[PDB]
Design a protein around this motif. Structure first.
Motif, PDB file in Angstrom:
ATOM      1  N   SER E 207      62.433  12.785  14.994  1.00 40.98           N
ATOM      2  CA  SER E 207      63.490  12.924  14.008  1.00 40.98           C
ATOM      3  C   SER E 207      64.667  12.038  14.381  1.00 40.98           C
ATOM      4  O   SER E 207      64.781  11.566  15.515  1.00 40.98           O
ATOM      5  CB  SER E 207      63.956  14.378  13.916  1.00 40.98           C
ATOM      6  N   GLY E 208      65.561  11.827  13.412  1.00 44.47           N
ATOM      7  CA  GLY E 208      66.820  11.174  13.725  1.00 44.47           C
ATOM      8  C   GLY E 208      67.615  11.925  14.771  1.00 44.47           C
ATOM      9  O   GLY E 208      68.335  11.315  15.563  1.00 44.47           O
ATOM     10  N   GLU E 209      67.489  13.256  14.792  1.00 50.36           N
ATOM     11  CA  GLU E 209      68.144  14.063  15.819  1.00 50.36           C
ATOM     12  C   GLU E 209      67.634  13.687  17.209  1.00 50.36           C
ATOM     13  O   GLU E 209      68.424  13.393  18.113  1.00 50.36           O
ATOM     14  CB  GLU E 209      67.921  15.557  15.538  1.00 50.36           C
ATOM     15  N   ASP E 210      66.309  13.690  17.390  1.00 45.98           N
ATOM     16  CA  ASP E 210      65.707  13.212  18.636  1.00 45.98           C
ATOM     17  C   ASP E 210      66.241  11.845  19.030  1.00 45.98           C
ATOM     18  O   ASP E 210      66.696  11.639  20.161  1.00 45.98           O
ATOM     19  CB  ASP E 210      64.192  13.131  18.485  1.00 45.98           C
ATOM     20  N   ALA E 211      66.186  10.891  18.103  1.00 40.31           N
ATOM     21  CA  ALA E 211      66.535   9.518  18.438  1.00 40.31           C
ATOM     22  C   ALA E 211      68.012   9.396  18.784  1.00 40.31           C
ATOM     23  O   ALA E 211      68.387   8.644  19.690  1.00 40.31           O
ATOM     24  CB  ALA E 211      66.170   8.598  17.272  1.00 40.31           C
ATOM     25  N   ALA E 212      68.869  10.118  18.062  1.00 40.17           N
ATOM     26  CA  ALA E 212      70.293  10.072  18.361  1.00 40.17           C
ATOM     27  C   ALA E 212      70.573  10.644  19.742  1.00 40.17           C
ATOM     28  O   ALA E 212      71.437  10.140  20.469  1.00 40.17           O
ATOM     29  CB  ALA E 212      71.070  10.831  17.288  1.00 40.17           C
ATOM     30  N   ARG E 213      69.836  11.692  20.123  1.00 48.32           N
ATOM     31  CA  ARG E 213      69.986  12.254  21.461  1.00 48.32           C
ATOM     32  C   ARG E 213      69.486  11.285  22.528  1.00 48.32           C
ATOM     33  O   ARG E 213      70.144  11.092  23.554  1.00 48.32           O
ATOM     34  CB  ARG E 213      69.247  13.586  21.569  1.00 48.32           C
ATOM     35  N   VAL E 214      68.332  10.653  22.299  1.00 51.03           N
ATOM     36  CA  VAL E 214      67.783   9.734  23.295  1.00 51.03           C
ATOM     37  C   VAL E 214      68.646   8.482  23.390  1.00 51.03           C
ATOM     38  O   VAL E 214      68.995   8.029  24.487  1.00 51.03           O
ATOM     39  CB  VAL E 214      66.317   9.403  22.963  1.00 51.03           C
ATOM     40  N   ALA E 215      69.023   7.914  22.241  1.00 51.86           N
ATOM     41  CA  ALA E 215      69.900   6.752  22.266  1.00 51.86           C
ATOM     42  C   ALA E 215      71.268   7.114  22.829  1.00 51.86           C
ATOM     43  O   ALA E 215      71.830   6.374  23.647  1.00 51.86           O
ATOM     44  CB  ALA E 215      70.033   6.161  20.856  1.00 51.86           C
ATOM     45  N   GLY E 216      71.821   8.256  22.406  1.00 57.86           N
ATOM     46  CA  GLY E 216      73.143   8.641  22.873  1.00 57.86           C
ATOM     47  C   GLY E 216      73.189   8.906  24.361  1.00 57.86           C
ATOM     48  O   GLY E 216      74.216   8.668  25.008  1.00 57.86           O
ATOM     49  N   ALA E 217      72.075   9.378  24.928  1.00 58.20           N
ATOM     50  CA  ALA E 217      71.977   9.600  26.362  1.00 58.20           C
ATOM     51  C   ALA E 217      71.858   8.305  27.152  1.00 58.20           C
ATOM     52  O   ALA E 217      72.042   8.328  28.373  1.00 58.20           O
ATOM     53  CB  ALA E 217      70.780  10.503  26.664  1.00 58.20           C
ATOM     54  N   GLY E 218      71.536   7.181  26.504  1.00 60.07           N
ATOM     55  CA  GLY E 218      71.543   5.916  27.218  1.00 60.07           C
ATOM     56  C   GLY E 218      70.359   4.985  27.042  1.00 60.07           C
ATOM     57  O   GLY E 218      70.344   3.904  27.638  1.00 60.07           O
ATOM     58  N   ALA E 219      69.369   5.363  26.239  1.00 60.39           N
ATOM     59  CA  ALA E 219      68.241   4.469  26.015  1.00 60.39           C
ATOM     60  C   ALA E 219      68.697   3.189  25.327  1.00 60.39           C
ATOM     61  O   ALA E 219      69.499   3.220  24.390  1.00 60.39           O
ATOM     62  CB  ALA E 219      67.174   5.151  25.171  1.00 60.39           C
ATOM     63  N   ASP E 220      68.202   2.056  25.830  1.00 57.92           N
ATOM     64  CA  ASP E 220      68.373   0.770  25.165  1.00 57.92           C
ATOM     65  C   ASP E 220      67.349   0.582  24.066  1.00 57.92           C
ATOM     66  O   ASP E 220      67.641  -0.068  23.047  1.00 57.92           O
ATOM     67  CB  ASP E 220      68.238  -0.369  26.175  1.00 57.92           C
ATOM     68  N   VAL E 221      66.154   1.136  24.263  1.00 53.81           N
ATOM     69  CA  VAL E 221      65.018   0.965  23.367  1.00 53.81           C
ATOM     70  C   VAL E 221      64.410   2.329  23.123  1.00 53.81           C
ATOM     71  O   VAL E 221      64.104   3.052  24.079  1.00 53.81           O
ATOM     72  CB  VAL E 221      63.948   0.029  23.963  1.00 53.81           C
ATOM     73  N   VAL E 222      64.208   2.670  21.857  1.00 48.90           N
ATOM     74  CA  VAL E 222      63.517   3.890  21.461  1.00 48.90           C
ATOM     75  C   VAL E 222      62.142   3.520  20.912  1.00 48.90           C
ATOM     76  O   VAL E 222      62.037   2.682  20.009  1.00 48.90           O
ATOM     77  CB  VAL E 222      64.329   4.671  20.416  1.00 48.90           C
ATOM     78  N   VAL E 223      61.089   4.148  21.440  1.00 45.41           N
ATOM     79  CA  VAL E 223      59.730   3.934  20.951  1.00 45.41           C
ATOM     80  C   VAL E 223      59.276   5.173  20.183  1.00 45.41           C
ATOM     81  O   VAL E 223      59.422   6.297  20.676  1.00 45.41           O
ATOM     82  CB  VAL E 223      58.762   3.611  22.106  1.00 45.41           C
ATOM     83  N   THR E 224      58.666   4.973  19.024  1.00 48.52           N
ATOM     84  CA  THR E 224      58.090   6.044  18.240  1.00 48.52           C
ATOM     85  C   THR E 224      56.791   5.626  17.631  1.00 48.52           C
ATOM     86  O   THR E 224      56.577   4.485  17.382  1.00 48.52           O
ATOM     87  CB  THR E 224      58.984   6.561  17.119  1.00 48.52           C
ATOM     88  N   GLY E 225      55.938   6.609  17.431  1.00 49.87           N
ATOM     89  CA  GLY E 225      54.632   6.441  16.856  1.00 49.87           C
ATOM     90  C   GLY E 225      54.675   6.538  15.353  1.00 49.87           C
ATOM     91  O   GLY E 225      55.716   6.557  14.755  1.00 49.87           O
ATOM     92  N   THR E 226      53.516   6.598  14.747  1.00 51.62           N
ATOM     93  CA  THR E 226      53.425   6.602  13.304  1.00 51.62           C
ATOM     94  C   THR E 226      53.116   7.902  12.595  1.00 51.62           C
ATOM     95  O   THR E 226      53.144   7.940  11.391  1.00 51.62           O
ATOM     96  CB  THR E 226      52.444   5.519  12.850  1.00 51.62           C
ATOM     97  N   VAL E 227      52.830   8.953  13.349  1.00 50.94           N
ATOM     98  CA  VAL E 227      52.543  10.263  12.788  1.00 50.94           C
ATOM     99  C   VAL E 227      53.751  10.796  12.011  1.00 50.94           C
ATOM    100  O   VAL E 227      54.862  10.819  12.496  1.00 50.94           O
ATOM    101  CB  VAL E 227      52.116  11.217  13.894  1.00 50.94           C
ATOM    102  N   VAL E 228      53.503  11.198  10.780  1.00 51.41           N
ATOM    103  CA  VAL E 228      54.532  11.666   9.867  1.00 51.41           C
ATOM    104  C   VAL E 228      54.592  13.178   9.821  1.00 51.41           C
ATOM    105  O   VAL E 228      53.602  13.829  10.102  1.00 51.41           O
ATOM    106  CB  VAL E 228      54.237  11.158   8.447  1.00 51.41           C
TER     107      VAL E 228
END
Lengths: 244, 241, 243, 238, 242, 236
Positions: E207-228
């Motif tokens: 989710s965008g929530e997940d990604a905002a938490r991972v990016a906000g914590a310091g990730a330079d690159v976020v990887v995600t799969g294709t499962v919807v």
């Protein structure tokens, strides 16, 4: 400390159980380590274990000397690697991580450090070290298969094996910071099967924790200093004495 | 059969002379031929019978251990190649860790599986550090060892000192059954001065002068297989020095 | 031959129904106690007695094997937890590789050390791939395994196809003795579709409904312990309900 | 090659022994490999083994490509890793490196590749693969403890085990480029103890070699132009 | 050069924002289904396509890589699961060591066997430490790992510093495809505090929530799969932007 | 003491000539002694002191490290035989992976345990791939290696390229302290052809002619445990 640590343990054990306070020389400065050891002394501890981590050796000598010149209980080295040998200590737990899958932690590291232990003439207490679920950081770093909390027979097998190989001390290690200490049923089964000095540590925080561990058969109870300290140690020693 | 503790027996002998033990593999002959070798080797002056050496059928071990226990009176010592090497009919067991194996099974795992059975049978357990030396024989291959190079005696000394620190009271320098040359005298000698354990040496010892150098180097115990009263000259050789 | 091959015996049963085997650990009771366990399980409909377990004395294995064979007429199959697991007195041995051990000794090395004894004794060797599934029990811990996760059936299938390709004719999904839940149905079924070998499932099968689900998902052989006749009868009827 | 390679093998051994030519697809171009292929066939080799080390599988596919529609001897995958599987060959030696200390080479690599072998429908021949000293590159990369030349009992034990586990072929490998072929008494002993097809390979250079290896029990001889002559002819010592 | 090096492309993006990468397993669909997924993900805002993640034959890899290369203008980066994972049709490869495998093959051996191939092909090789975090997924199982416990961020930081000191310029915290929960924020932030590498986080980011938490914590690159697809990616990319 | 990054210092030397480092086991003498071996080493022309190769106590290092540092003006480089080889009194550390160990502790595990300390101390970390060649000496035995065989230079070149791709900028061909014969010239040369790393060669380098042939085959750095002749040999 002049007396032999192993003789000193047997002296205590005629009347009560032993408590040992674990200090990581990396977590503080030597002077801070002294004020921790002194607070634990006021709390009733019987000795300082020094080590627990894998880290630089110069901080160990510094911490060990500051201890050796300021306290009157034994300083026992609890090495997390070959770096863990220092001259200013009174004894070393010369241990084999029995349930590592990596020969380095079972036999290889101690072969590398053996000549240095001899050269310094430090008293070596032969010890089987057994990591119990969850195992903490030592269980991860040392490549262990932690013994499952519901398989006490596995633990008893390794304790009997350790006794048959000549190890006179046996340590059930749940891991520093474990949410639950080693189960009583496992401590009691190990105690029944061996005549070794039985040491238990990991996740022993309260006096009721220490009483359960001690009541189950632990000769030696090890705790860290996360909490206030003097008070934590005193409650732990109280629970330890609360048993028969 | 043997009433006394094999370990006190060892110290009694060592107050005057060095010890010889005869290794017998239970699979290379029937029980009653093994009694032949046993008694013949006793006539040659051996002080005890080592049983095992390879991974073997366990009911064979029981039959050879029985045949020996009913007929000889020197101690029968199990030299186990696996947990298959424990038998009720023996006087003692070398309770050993293969120190320079790279596999945890041979270092510590096998012995944890057998410990309860040793305790159940109440057989005397002699705590032994076992160290394989180049070339190392079949035991060095099967046990996944890194055989100690013959020109690295400091390595053997480190493991001997470590075994003693761990509480092992015997220490076994093993060149492997059938090795062309026995363990170097320099290695035996350096190990002996580093540790106060009972030093056992085995592998590649055939002649009486092989005996003499191994024993003269510092060995407390000399172990030899068979090739028949080829034992007294080893004994002879061991004698003197 | 007076006594047929155990592998032939299995295929004959599998012509009409599924096979049940009763696991007896020789170190958990006396030989005569073991005989009464076996006789009760046979009254309950079991097709054979498996003999073994981790933690095993060769003297007690032989005494239990000898006592069983004096008293019963179904096959006695060794289920060895180590090389100490070979006994003259059994009818056959599961000659198995612990496929998902990280230790070569349990994959191949232990079996090399006893191959000669198996050949000397002339005991029928059934070639089997043995695969430990989460949680895996004591064998999973002693045997240095990475238990297959219950939610990763594709992994189990890959091991089943490989064992078949290597020539193993039997395949054993082991949840571990005493597991809270047997190997999942989805995993049993996917393994069964990917291979033509005899498929054995064991660990945590306590009730007739446990046995019905495991048999219905595709197991040819159901293996159960004896912690509580009776229990065995309900299991055997559960397996039949699936025919 | 329409028939099963294993049936094919058994037909040959009712009268004579078998020779296989090993081709590494990284040492030559696909059309250069077909040249080596034909020369060894003219020379009497019985089939082409395709593999030998871990190399790009596009290299492998194309070398298997030309080879299939130029020759009528079987193409047999001799995989050094999971990269070693191609739709093009007639069969694959589905093998376990028995004396590796690493689970990947005993059992793990074959598990990762099994679904692929099954999809491509390739005939898979179950083989125990045992490295004898000196063992060569494969012995080093496959983390092996090579069986000492003076320990034939060890090799016999693994042969019996492989047979007990249902492996119908057994390969005694001295390593490509070994100074000496596998010791005759080792070959003799393992052949005495098993009913499997016994493949020997590694350091079999002259007609004396292929003769002595075949005379000691080997059912199949593996070698890496028309030098096959004295090999196959040498294998005339029945 | 007409085409940037992928590593320079990464740094260019990082001057303004964080990088999203879309992981595609070639064994999970046909090459043209993969094109559909990838073009959707590009519409969603992904910065690149990672290709691999299983152990699978090299023929499905090449077909997918070829079809992607015809149809997209963002880099294709190989995320190899074994030596089979190298293909000449990619723009770059994550040349990775599985730092916390207990098996030398996954730490160093497999990379030694494929290095000659990587050199002969032209493939830009991004040096990366790959660290499997609890629960670890299928890769943590196949790769013989001891997954880093979620409550042990100090261990993850030690391997991050070590990888940096060994020359690895990228560091990947991998919770495993399909992990119920992404790598802990505490672990991400401690790792970012200790290293100057490009920090990649993947596994269980849905989710965008997940990604905002991972990016906000310091990730330079976020990887995600294709499962919807275009939606999920856009939701993830906008979360990262926040 | 130093100043100047050891890595730049290496590159400055290699613009002109090849480098020589002097290996000092601090356990086989006393700090005051080690200084003399070092001072004698530099008057022989060596470019830096490598401190370790063991297999040691670490009070011996910190004291040999200080003794070497307050007496000398070439770089002090730790060559750790374990985590025991980190001392703040050194100028840099070969932060290395034992690439052909079968044990993960020697490949990656030991270095993870000491990484936090190296960061705390601010010691310059040179990224290095360490490859044991037969016979391999004591390090090859202790470190659980499969030493690269002398007749298999493709193996060494495969690992050289892999370590370059992983980011290690230094590659070290180690025949072992005391090896009878040095790394095969064909192997040194093939490794040099295959990567662009600083290529280091050690173990079994006795004579000026030894140091002439290894440096001649492609070595950028020559390590030896005399030195005058080693240095002149390296020219060539």
């Amino acid at each position: 400390f002049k007396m032999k640590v192993e003789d000193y343990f047997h002296d205590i054990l005629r009347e009560r159980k032993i408590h040992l306070t674990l200090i990581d020389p990396e977590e503080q400065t030597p002077e801070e380590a002294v004020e921790i050891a002194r607070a634990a002394i006021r709390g009733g501890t019987d000795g300082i274990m020094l080590g627990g981590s894998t880290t630089d050796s110069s901080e160990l000598d510094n911490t060990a000397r500051a201890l050796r010149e300021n306290i009157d209980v034994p300083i026992i080295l609890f090495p997390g690697n070959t770096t863990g040998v220092s001259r200013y200590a009174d004894a070393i737990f010369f241990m084999s991580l029995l349930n590592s899958t990596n020969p380095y932690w079972i036999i290889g590291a101690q072969a590398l450090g053996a000549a240095t232990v001899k050269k310094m003439g430090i008293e070596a207490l032969p010890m089987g070290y057994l990591v119990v679920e969850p195992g903490g950081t030592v269980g991860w770093v040392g490549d262990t298969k932690p013994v499952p909390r519901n398989k006490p027979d596995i633990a008893a097998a390794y304790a009997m094996e350790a006794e048959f190989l000549g190890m006179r001390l046996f340590y059930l290690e749940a891991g520093s910071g474990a949410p639950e200490h080693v189960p009583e049923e496992m401590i009691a089964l190990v105690k029944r099967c061996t005549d070794q000095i039985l040491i238990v540590g990991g996740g022993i925080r309260s006096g009721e924790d220490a009483a359960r561990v001690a009541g189950a058969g632990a000769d030696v109870v090890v705790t860290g200093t996360v909490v206030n300290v003097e008070d934590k140690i005193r409650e732990i020693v109280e629970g330890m004495g609360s048993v028969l």
